[PDB]
Structure formats: structure tokens, C-alpha cells
Amino acid sequence: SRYSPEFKDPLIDKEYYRKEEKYVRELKKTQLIKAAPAGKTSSVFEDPVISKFTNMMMIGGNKVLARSLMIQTLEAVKRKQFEKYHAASAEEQATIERNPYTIFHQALKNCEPMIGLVPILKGGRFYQVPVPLPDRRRRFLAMKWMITECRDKKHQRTLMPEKLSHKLLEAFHNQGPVIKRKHDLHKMAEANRALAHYRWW
Amino acid sequence: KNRAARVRVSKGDKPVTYEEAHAPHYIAHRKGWLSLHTGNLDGEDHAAERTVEDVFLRKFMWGTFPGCLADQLVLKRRGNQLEICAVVLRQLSPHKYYFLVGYSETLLSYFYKCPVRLHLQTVPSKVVYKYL
Amino acid sequence: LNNIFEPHVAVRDAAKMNIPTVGIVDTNCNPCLITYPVPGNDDSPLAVHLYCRLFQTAITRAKEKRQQVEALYRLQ
Amino acid sequence: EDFIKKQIEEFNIGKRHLANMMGEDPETFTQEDIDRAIAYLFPSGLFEKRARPVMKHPEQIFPRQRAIQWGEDGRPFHYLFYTGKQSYYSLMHDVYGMLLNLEKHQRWLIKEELEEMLVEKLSDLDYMQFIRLLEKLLTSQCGAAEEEFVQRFRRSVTLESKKQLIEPVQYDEQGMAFSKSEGKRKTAKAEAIVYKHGSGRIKVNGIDYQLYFPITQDREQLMFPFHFVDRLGKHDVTCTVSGGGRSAQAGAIRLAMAKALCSFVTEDEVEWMRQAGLLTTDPRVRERKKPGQEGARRKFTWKKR
Amino acid sequence: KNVLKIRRRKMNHHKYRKLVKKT
RNA sequence: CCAGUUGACACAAAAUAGACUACGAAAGUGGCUUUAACAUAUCUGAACACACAAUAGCUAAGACCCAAACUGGGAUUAGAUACCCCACUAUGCUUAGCCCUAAACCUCAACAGUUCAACAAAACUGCUCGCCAGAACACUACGAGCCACAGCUUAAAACUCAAAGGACCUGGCGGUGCUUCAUAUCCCUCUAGAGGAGCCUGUUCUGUAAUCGAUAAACCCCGAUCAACCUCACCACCUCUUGCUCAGCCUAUAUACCGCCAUCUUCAGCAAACCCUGAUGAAGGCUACAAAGUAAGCGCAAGUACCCACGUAAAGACGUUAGGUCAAGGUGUAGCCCAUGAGGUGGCAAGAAAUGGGCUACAUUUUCUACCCCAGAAACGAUAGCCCUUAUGAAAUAAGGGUCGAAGGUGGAUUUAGCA
Ligand SMILES: [Mg+2]
Ligand SMILES: [Mg+2]
Ligand SMILES: [Mg+2]
Ligand SMILES: [Mg+2]
Ligand SMILES: [Mg+2]
Ligand SMILES: [Mg+2]
Ligand SMILES: [Mg+2]
Ligand SMILES: [Mg+2]
Ligand SMILES: [Mg+2]
Ligand SMILES: [Mg+2]
Ligand SMILES: [Mg+2]
Ligand SMILES: [Mg+2]
Ligand SMILES: [Mg+2]
Ligand SMILES: [Mg+2]
């Protein structure tokens, strides 16, 4: 890896960059900084979770096209949501969200799993042992599930942005294939439970 | 490993020279270039004929002295000057040295249409690199 | 007697070089090859203090008498 | 040992001849003559830095070792001669004597450095014991003379990496507080002219940023620095981008704008930006294409398996 | 030593027992 | 009759104390009451006799829920009288007709005493009987004794040989328990080309007048930065022992080389010259409240240059496959000396069969178009081959124009690099 050990990984947001203080300042000064990429931005509006989602959605190893398509689909979903909300009631800003960031947060909450089946072994035979996972790992798993569902390579009709918008609208409120896969995984994990007595760690 | 021109450790007081002890990845690092000829240049062309002439001259000079050329020469082309730096060893008497040197110089100057001249390596110590 | 349960190895080195060695041997020692074993206590501090004082005085007087007598003899 | 003196005398004669070569009057020349020589009549060209022509008086290059270890009928230079490395043990005994004297009264170097200082090849545990003794001495009644004698074997702190090279506001050239800068991203360079006033648009390569990069990521990258500093609109630029393509040029412009901002910004925000990561150049640069591999780092398939 | 000199003895004894039981 | 509080039927079995010390020539033993219990105390003196049984077994049987020899039925099962689950028949507790063999070892006999071949149950002499000084044959045929009729005490002689047996030295090994641990290198996690398939491409090898190099480990876009007579270095017809060579060999001995280089290395050290540890033998040189290393020489380290100093081209020690090669090229030695060389003339390019290394698609990503990102078809992939050819030639190789316009809907547990 080219990332030399002399350098370090800084932050990206400017939440705390709005000014123990001297100690933290000296610690940050005693660091060789690199440079942020094109996708990662300091815009407080641009939530970093959508940035990580777009990074995971890197199709063909190109982040430009993936980010453009993701932003277009988010804009389309936001337009549909505001047409369903604005062109309806007066100011009911509590029953429907107000931004695509909140839409993606709700989609993650509805798709973020909680159990991770694992084939743990003890010598030469696997064993069904639910292994825990932190928030980052669960979010990455949900993102990978969304990716492999949106690009299942079996539709052969609809378009990429239309498919993504439809699947997002589905995952919005308990619908779509991602939540079905999550429920199937939960069922498979809860099937055989009395087997977690064979974990080495 | 790679023994392109090196010699791994063996004894301690064995014979070995500079050219007889170097790695392939040190051709220009720890080792120099024994042929600063006007061939392999860039963007200048003309390399095949220059290398052929250099090899011919080196082989001829090695064949001249019998049993006195351990390493190759170091040809130098200063335009119309052929300077030779042979690793010659003190053989016998200076009369034969001068006779052979003059004969070879005249022959090469009349053949190659360019002045040629050499100089012996009167040193009581070789260019030993590794003690081996 | 060093810190470990074992006498000093210098006795064997001395025996391997023809050297008459002296030693403040004790019960835990092994006067096998020592040419001049000196049994005595090694735990009390005053004992070692007296040992070292006697050694200093003896060697100093020996060197002084050496210098004096050798000078007086070479003067002959 | 005689060969050392022989070579020293030979090199002294050589240096005498070299000094006699030049017809000038300065005999105690400095490194200027050696540099001129290496530049003219000694251009080796070897990539290495050791086999190069570095002829110098061996009076200081040739290392020294323990001279004589005995005199009139033996008699070394200390009573710890048979212990090997008598100097180190004598210094340790002196340190212990000073410790006992102080008791009656009431950064560090590397092993190779200590070996070079002395003439003994000490190990690591002996050095640890020496450090322990020095620490015990420093702790036993903090004074001044002993503290300095112990620090003699130590170095200062010399703190670095603190302040930022604050660039001037630059008021010359024209009547605007502009500031030059640059940016790198996969082989790329630029020179921006970010002004201080002008709450409006920005001229990217002489043309607005609407027909140049309609993508929103480019505008977000361009806003990165101004958004971090909160000085958004109040800024006009007439940069001249070159090299790269898309994301490379975007990152170059971002770095140039960040530098132009940090040029005339309070030290607090300057340090915050420097530590956030938007001034230096990340290691992500056009690497060397591996010749022994198909692409970059992707090695052959069934190489080890 | 170990139980090594008795292996051949047991082999011979087992061969004899098998020869007896056979015929 | 499975879990039992109010109770129940064996010749069983000694829960902690058993951590205790004994006798018996030795077997032999431990929860309890009683009969009788420890011979000579100078030793030895039958393997031609009086007796025990270690554990087991034949015969007459009693006999303990509790165990197995005979056991059935089933993981695994390629082939299991054992292994993983139920108990049971001679026998474990008892009286007699009996071989008394063992690891009846504490492999070290009883008394008088005194102070190391190696493994070590320390060393030195007297006393008594027993033992042997070729193994496999030889805990056996045969002979002598036994109520055994599968055996016991002894138990030999032939063909083979250099024997044979025991111990010792640091190593490879640890599906050895464990210590440092493996960072894409390993499982848990994934980013992704390739697996079903189109195109360039050869592998096991076929064919004549068209060799090919271990053409596994390190070959299968390797040498080939590529096979129309050159390139193919491979053979025949006009002629030779001057064959263009004062001949060569691309012919061969990898059990003899020079030559380049991955591999373990993503380690960690090798040793000259010295001085020590084994009653100096195969070997070793061993840890700071310090128990023998200085260690010629080769090393990481110092990076050799750069995107600095990580990371890249390549290691990184004595070495690892008589490593690839007698033919990438030359070469000891043998053969051709009516050639396997050839002076001039004639000869391939296809995969019978499987496969993989690179460019490609299964989806709106195959076409990106005037705009590289403000505007979208077939609803599929819409090949190769062939013809006109950029080039030329006695047989096309990268590809431009026309035609075909396919092969199959990520297809097998997945495979390899990746900590940017
Ligand atoms: Mg007896
Ligand atoms: Mg008797
Ligand atoms: Mg019995
Ligand atoms: Mg039973
Ligand atoms: Mg029974
Ligand atoms: Mg009983
Ligand atoms: Mg018996
Ligand atoms: Mg027994
Ligand atoms: Mg081979
Ligand atoms: Mg290698
Ligand atoms: Mg290095
Ligand atoms: Mg490299
Ligand atoms: Mg070989
Ligand atoms: Mg021929």
C-alpha cells in the first residue's frame, strides 16, 4: 500500500471545525495530512452515508457515473414524494419526510439487518452460529444487499434509474425485495438457534 | 537468486576482480559502464555498427597480449580518437612492450583510418572488490 | 560465590593458564584447585571490610618495599 | 595498523599535488575545490552514493581503535582491563561512585551512537543498565552540575510542525487582493487567482462553471473550501486549469482555492483546514505500471496456486 | 529400552497359534 | 418400573479419611464384630521333592441387580468379531480332579562391611547356587516328567550372513499442549476480471518431402516483441569426404558445464582464525541480580532512483529441486566422415477429442451519439467465417465497407490481487 505510515487519516466534515483544546490542536498539528477525494465533500448537507452508499455502488470502478445516477434517482424519488405531499394537503410536514437524506436513512433503517449467520467450525465441520456485527458492518451488508437487488441481472425490461427509484419507493414503507431478503435471513437464523455453543471467539 | 556476474562467498584469499563480482541489478549502481561508446545513445541513432566495432576492437586487443587481459577495455571516442585503457600485467621486458605497442598502433591507425593507442596498467594491485 | 548457586568460573580458567590463585573460600565453595584457600565468613560486612583493608595495606607496603629495595639494588 | 598510516601519507602526498596543481594562493581550500573537481574531472555517474568519487583527507574518515593497552610490564590504563571494554565499566563505576557521594550528601542516544562515541561495541542490556544508573543519578537529589553532565549524553527537544507558512495577501499586480496557488491530482498543475471581493460567480478557465462542468460533484468540490471557511459568495477567480481531465482538474482547483483561502485567513481556520485535509497532495498519484504484471498490482492468476 | 524385542516374539507366537487353530 | 418426598427382595462394593504402615519367600489387601495372627533373627545350600497362586483355562456344579468371550440391530462404513448405543453365555463369591506360566520387575539375590561405554537404581571386595559367551529356525520338531491332550521345565540340529543386540550426537516431524504470530493472508467479510460463451492464443499429440525447448513443480499470449522458400532451427533430388568453413553438427550424453532466474524469503542468520563444554565419541558453545563468545568473510538493516523515507523492476546470506537446457547460444566425450551437414532444386498454418492466458456480452451498462455527461433505439446478445481490401506475397495476419449477424439469460462448492 502507498499509504505511508507517516501520514494519517483526517476527518471530512466541518461539524467540530468551528473554532484540552490546546492538546487536541497540538495532536492534530503533529500529523502529516493527505487530501480528500472528489466524492467526499465537507458540505454538511451532503450526508456521508449517501457518500458511502455511492462508493459501494461503484459500477465498473467508476464513481462519477454511479454518483450521477444515484443523485438523479434521489432527485426523482424526492420529486415523487413532494408531488404526493405538496400537491395534496397544506403543510403536513410530519407524516412525510423533507429531503432525500431522510429517505435514505429510513430505507437503511428498514433494511439494516440485525443477525449475521456464520458457518463457524471447530476442527473440520461448520456450525450455524449467529455472529454479531457493529453498525458499520450491518450498514455495509444492507448496502450490498440493495446493490445486488437493484442489479440482479434478471429484469430485462426496465431501466437502471427507474428500477432504482421503484425499489427505493418500495423499501420506503415495508416493501421491495431487500426487506424480503432480510426477513428470510432472520427466519433462517431463528430456525436453528441452539447451536451458538461452538464459537472459538 | 541471480549470478549474472557475482560470486558468492567461498574462501577468503581467492582471486577476483571488480567485473568478476557484481549483481545484475547493480549494472549502473555499484558498477560502472565498461563501454562509453557512441552506440546505445538517444535520441541519436547508429548503435549496431558501433557495438560491432567495439566488440571487434575489444576481442582484437584481448587476443593481442597473450594471457594478460582479465577484464575488457574501456573504449573512448573523442571524435577521431580511439583511447584504450587495457588491464595489462607486467609480462617481461620493455623492449617487447614498446615494439608490440608501436606495431599495433601503426596497424590500427593505417587500417581504421583513425589514430589508435593504448596504455598498460602498471599497478601492483588489481581492482579486487569482494574478498571472497 | 556469585548471585547464582555456582562458584566463579574463573578458577577453571586460572587452572588452565598456570596461575596460583587465592580465594576467600567458605562452606558453599569448592576448594578443589585453589592454591591458597582462605576459609572465612562472607555474609558479615565487617569481615569483608577488614579483608579489603588488609589487602590494601599489604599490597601497598609490598609495592613500596619493592620500589625501595629494587632501587637500592640497581644502584649497586 | 601500519597500512592506515601508509594510505594516510599517500593521500597527503596526493592532496599536496592537487594543491600544487592550481596556481592560485589559497592552500586551505574548502569543499569548493572538491565540488569543482567532481563536477569537471571526476564525473562517475554511478547511481549509488558511496562508490562515487569522494576523495577526502582520511585524517577524519579512517576510524580509530584502541591504541596501546599496556606499558611498562603490562600495567593497562584501568583496573577493569580484563573485563572487556574497560572504558564503559570505568564510566559505570564512576557513575556509581557519584551516586554514593550524592546519597551521602543527602533524548537518549542509540546503541550505535554510544559505540561511535566510545571505542567499545556494547550490547543492549548493558546500555539498559547504564540508562538505569543515569536515571537513578538524575533522581538522587536534583541538582545542576550532575543534571548537565547527564544531559551531555542526551539531545534537546526541537519541536517541529506547529505554525503554517502564512502567505501574504498579495496586493501588487493589480488593485485586488488576489493570491496564487496550485493543485496536484494524478499528474496535474494549475495556477489560480482567487480574489477577495466580488460576491457573485467564478470564471473557470475564462468561462463560467455552468457550461464547463454541469455535474454537481464538480460544483461540490469547488465549494468544499469556501464552504469550509464559510466565505462562500464573496470570492471571484480567474484560474487557468491545465493537465488532468475531470476529477483531477476538480481536485487541483479545490487545492488551489483552499491554498488561496488559507493565504489570508486567521490562524485558527488555517490550521483547521490544514488538519482536515485540503492543502497537501494525497499519495493517490499515477503509479508505475508493473512490467512483471498484466496491469498495475494485479499479478498473474495461477501464480502461487 | 522400550517394548521392541517382544514384537517378533509375539509375531511368532501368533503365527504358531494360527497354525494350531487352523489344523 | 421416566424426576421421588412417606418403603421394598442378591454369594454386589469399598464414597474423602486411603495424604496411612504392614506382613507374607512372593502372590495378596483396605466400610465393620469374633476364632485363630508376623518361622528360626548367623547366611547360603533341589529348575531330580512338600505348596501358593499372580490373571486366565479343561472337568462336577452352586451362584451376585451388577460385566463382558457367543452377541443382534444402526454413525462412519471403501474393505470393521474392536471403536460410537442395551444387557447377556465358560469366568468375577464357594468345594474338588489339574499345566504353574507371567513383566510372580522393585528385570538390581541374603550376610559382612568400607567411601559413571552411555542411560543411569552411587562406587569398592569375600561368601552360596543359577545364567550364557551366533541371531531368525530355537517360548520349537524330537526326547524325559505332568490325569494339559491348543500347554508347562529343559528343549537341538541343516542353507543364508557378515553378524546380531543395547545406548549415544544435533536434526527433518510434530492431525504434539502451548509462546510470539500470519493482515489480503487465513476463516469469518467483501471490490472485481474468468467460470455457461464470441474473438487472438497454444497444452496431452496426431501428418508427409512441414524436429521444436523439463514444452508438470518455474509451460498452456512462455521462448514468438508471433509459423508465405527467410521466420520452421525439420526431411528428400542434382555431389562431398575442402562439407562457404584448412568442415561442422540446431546429433546425445542433465549422472559431467559456461549461460540467465522464479521458488522457499511474507527468514534470519551461515563461518574461516581463535578459546571452551562431554573420564573430550558421534556434537554443542547455551538468557544482564549475567551460565563462553570475539566472531575473517556473505547479509536484512543503509535502500540502491523515483511519486520524500511506505510502495515500484529485483533479490536480501552459507542454500532449496545431479533445478530448465548439451538444441536461447558455445562446450569434455561419443556418432555422422555415402550425414542426423548440407553448395543449388521440392515441402505446413487444422484442433480427431478436452482446456485455459488476454479483448468482449447476458442488460438498458451490448451504440455512446452533434454535447462527454441537461436530448434516447433493438427490447437481447443483433459473432466468426466469407467477399472488396489498406501490405504483399506460391496458402492471412491488427482491421475499414457488404453479408452472416451468432454462441446463451453469472452458468458448479467458486478463483485470483486488493488494508487504497
Ligand atoms: Mg542360595
Ligand atoms: Mg542345603
Ligand atoms: Mg495361580
Ligand atoms: Mg455381561
Ligand atoms: Mg454369565
Ligand atoms: Mg469380594
Ligand atoms: Mg517359573
Ligand atoms: Mg509378570
Ligand atoms: Mg529438464
Ligand atoms: Mg527469485
Ligand atoms: Mg533494502
Ligand atoms: Mg520490484
Ligand atoms: Mg539440471
Ligand atoms: Mg543432409
Residues of D in contact with B31 (CB under 8 A): 46
Residues of D in contact with A26 (CB under 8 A): 162
8 A C-beta contact, residue B123 and residue B86: no
**Looking up cell 552514493, which residue turns up?**
D49
Residue A3 dihedral angles phi and psi, to the nearest 5°: -55, 95
How far apart (Å, rounded) are the C-alpha atoms in residues A150 and A148? 6
The DSSP bridge pattern shows strands A126-128 and A119-121 to be antiparallel
The secondary element (H helix, E strand) that includes residue C36 is strand C36-37
8 A C-beta contact, residue A142 and residue A111: yes
How far apart (Å, rounded) are the C-alpha atoms in residues A104 and D31? 69
How far apart (Å, rounded) are the C-alpha atoms in residues D191 and D242? 9
How far apart (Å, rounded) are the C-alpha atoms in residues C54 and B7? 64
How many angstroms is C1' of F390 away from CA of A175? 60
Residue D13 alpha carbon to ligand 12 centre in Å:
45
How far apart (Å, rounded) are the C-alpha atoms in residues C35 and E2? 49
What cell numbers appear for A71 in the block?
Answer: 443523485
Query: How many CA atoms, within 13 angstroms, populate the side-chain half-sphere of residue D235?
Result: 22
Query: How many CA atoms, within 13 angstroms, populate the side-chain half-sphere of residue D30?
Result: 1
Contacts of D205 by beta carbon, 8 Å cutoff, 6+ apart: D212, D239, D240, D241
Q: Which of D185, D184, D181 is nearest to D195 (CA)?
A: D181
Residue B27 dihedral angles phi and psi, to the nearest 5°: -60, -40
Give chain F positions with protein CB within 7 A. Answer: 103, 107, 136-137, 139-140, 150-151, 165-167, 184, 187-193, 218, 259-264, 266, 272, 275-277, 288-292, 294-299, 304-305, 307-320, 356-358, 362-365, 373-374, 379, 409-410, 415-420
8 A C-beta contact, residue A60 and residue A48: no
What letter represents residue A197's amino acid?
H
Answer positive or negative: Cα dihedral of B12, B13, B14, B16: positive
Chain breaks in chain E (C to N over 2.5 A) after: none
| Nearest nucleotide relative to D84: CA against C1' | F294
Which residue among A2, A3, A35 places its CB closest to the CB of D277? A35
How far is the CA of D193 from the CAs of D232, D256, D287, in angstroms?
A: 16, 9, 30
Buried b (16+ CB within 10 A) or exposed e, A179-188: bebbeebeee
How far is the CA of C4 from the CAs of C11, C27, D44, in angstroms?
A: 16, 15, 60
* CA-atom Rg of chain E in angstroms: 11
How far apart (Å, rounded) are the C-alpha atoms in residues A165 and A168? 5
How far apart (Å, rounded) are the C-alpha atoms in residues D91 and D131? 12
How far apart (Å, rounded) are the C-alpha atoms in residues B107 and D147? 80
The DSSP bridge pattern shows strands C36-37 and D189-191 to be unpaired
Nearest 10 degrees: CA dihedral of D103, D104, D109, D113? -140
Contacts of B63 by beta carbon, 8 Å cutoff, 6+ apart: none
Interface partners of D (3+ CB pairs, < 8 Å)? A, B
D300, burial (CB in 10 Å: exposed 0-12, middle 13-18, buried 19+): exposed
What cell numbers appear for B19 in the block?
Answer: 567485473
Find the length of chain E: 23
Backbone torsion region of residue D40, taken as left when φ is above 0, otherwise alpha when ψ lies between -120 and 50, otherwise beta: alpha
Contacts of A90 by beta carbon, 8 Å cutoff, 6+ apart: none
In the DSSP assignment, the letter for residue A132 is P
The secondary element (H helix, E strand) that includes residue B98 is helix B94-111
What cell numbers appear for D280 in the block?
Answer: 497537501
- Long-range pairs for B35-44 at CB < 8 Å and ≥24 separation? B35/B72, B35/B74, B35/B75, B36/B74, B36/B75, B36/B76, B37/B75, B37/B77, B38/B77
SS3 state at A35 = strand
Q: Do B32 and D47 touch (CB under 8 A)?
A: no
8 A C-beta contact, residue D224 and residue A41: yes
Q: Which of D95, D194, D209 is nearest to D146 (CA)?
A: D95
8 A C-beta contact, residue D88 and residue D118: yes
How far apart (Å, rounded) are the C-alpha atoms in residues B18 and D147? 53
Buried b (16+ CB within 10 A) or exposed e, D47-69: eeeeeeeeeeebeeeeeeeeeee
Residue A131 dihedral angles phi and psi, to the nearest 5°: -105, 130
How far apart (Å, rounded) are the C-alpha atoms in residues C38 and C47? 13
- Chain D residues 256 to 285 whose Cβ lies within 7 Å of strand F are 283-285
- Long-range pairs for C36-43 at CB < 8 Å and ≥24 separation? C42/C1
Q: Which of B94, B96, B93, B90 is nearest to B67 (CA)?
A: B90
Q: Which of B21, B8, B2, B3 is nearest to B126 (CA)?
A: B21
The answer to whether B78 CB sits below 7 Å from nucleic acid chain F is no
SS3 state at A40 = coil
How far apart (Å, rounded) are the C-alpha atoms in residues B83 and C10? 68
8 A C-beta contact, residue A67 and residue A39: yes
In the DSSP assignment, the letter for residue A151 is T
Residue D32 dihedral angles phi and psi, to the nearest 5°: -60, -45
HEC assignment per residue over chain D: CHHHHHHHHHHHHHHHHHHHHCCCCCCCCCHHHHHHHHHCCCCCCCCCCCCCCCCCCHHHHCCCCCCCCCECCECCCCCCHHHCCHHHHHHHHHHHHHHHHHHHHCCCCCHHHHHHHCCCCCCCHHHHHHHHHHHHHHHCCCCCHHHHHHHCCCCCCCCCCCCCCCCCCCCCCCCCCCCCCCCCCCCCEEECCCCCCCECCCEECCEECCCCCCCHHHHHHHHHHHHHHCCCCECCCCCEEECCCCHHHHHHHHHHHHHHHHHCCCHHHHHHHHHHCECCCCCCCCCCCCCCCCCCCCCCCCCCC
Q: If you measure CA to CA, which chain D residue comes closest to B129?
A: D51
The secondary element (H helix, E strand) that includes residue A121 is strand A119-121
The answer to whether A125 CB sits below 7 Å from nucleic acid chain F is no
Q: Count each helix (H run) and each strand (E run) in chain C, helices first.
A: 2, 2
What cell numbers appear for E17 in the block?
Answer: 497359534
Give yes or no for B130 touching D (CB within 8 A): no
Centroid of chain to Cα C27: 17
Contacts of D199 by beta carbon, 8 Å cutoff, 6+ apart: D233, D234, D235
How far is the CA of D300 from the CAs of A1, D287, D291, D297, in angstroms?
A: 18, 19, 12, 10
Chain breaks in chain C (C to N over 2.5 A) after: none
Contacts of D38 by beta carbon, 8 Å cutoff, 6+ apart: D52, D53, D54
Q: Do D48 and B30 touch (CB under 8 A)?
A: yes
Q: Do D227 and A43 touch (CB under 8 A)?
A: yes
